[PDB]
Amino acid sequence: GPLGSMDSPPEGYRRNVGICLMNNDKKIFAASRLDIPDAWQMPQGGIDEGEDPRNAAIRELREETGVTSAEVIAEVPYWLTYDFPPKVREKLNIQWGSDWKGQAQKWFLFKFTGQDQEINLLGDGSEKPEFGEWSWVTPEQLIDLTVEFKKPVYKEVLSVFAPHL
């Protein structure tokens, strides 16, 4: 069958955690890039120095979106690992200044229990704004927004969170 997970953080990939948030309409919180038009994605982070995923995610979320009214409804039993192209990799190495093939992250489903006013793409006054906009999309739509190298990594999250969406 499908093979796009990881029951353990492999080598080359840096610690990371994803936060899959959904709306009362059963949509998935998708945010557009602040540098790439039409580039949508979900809030994620490379975990904190010696931080547990579930925490880094719940934390990272309030850092990337600042969403305070959100609770976990699901958690992918495995880790999601992806890779970047020779332009992104080669670019990150200089822009980000890191030498990694990708990032293994354990996506966690979060049910929004607040108001659209809580959604702050900037962050909780910690990190700098990464997204410029956001919208609600179905697990199939968000999949259409995601990129080829991030399709499975996402579909996995949704797939695992299907019963919740």
Ligand X SMILES: Nc1ncnc2c1ncn2[C@@H]1O[C@H](COP(=O)(O)OP(=O)(O)OP(=O)(O)O)[C@@H](O)[C@H]1O
Q: Is 152 in the site for ligand X (CB under 6 A)?
A: no
In the bound complex, what is the minimum distance in angstroms from residue 16's beta carbon to ligand X? 5
Phi, psi of 11 (to 5 degrees): -85, 150
In the bound complex, what is the minimum distance in angstroms from residue 128's beta carbon to ligand X? 12
Stretch 60-89: interaction string toward ligand X, x if CB under 6 A: ------------------------x---x-
Task: Read off the tokens for 95.
Answer: 């822009």
Q: Is 150 in the site for ligand X (CB under 6 A)?
A: yes
Handedness of CA 125, 45, 54, 121 (dihedral sign): positive
Which of 13, 15, 16, 112 forms a contact with ligand X (CB under 6 A)?
16
Cβ–Cβ under 8 Å, residues 105 and 17: yes
Which of 13, 20, 42, 45 forms a contact with ligand X (CB under 6 A)?
45
Which of 15, 30, 32, 46 forms a contact with ligand X (CB under 6 A)?
46
Count CB atoms within 10 A of the CB of residue 32.
18
SS3 160: helix
Cβ–Cβ under 8 Å, residues 80 and 18: yes
Which residues are at the interface with ligand X (CB under 6 A)? 16, 39, 41, 44-46, 84, 88, 103, 147, 150
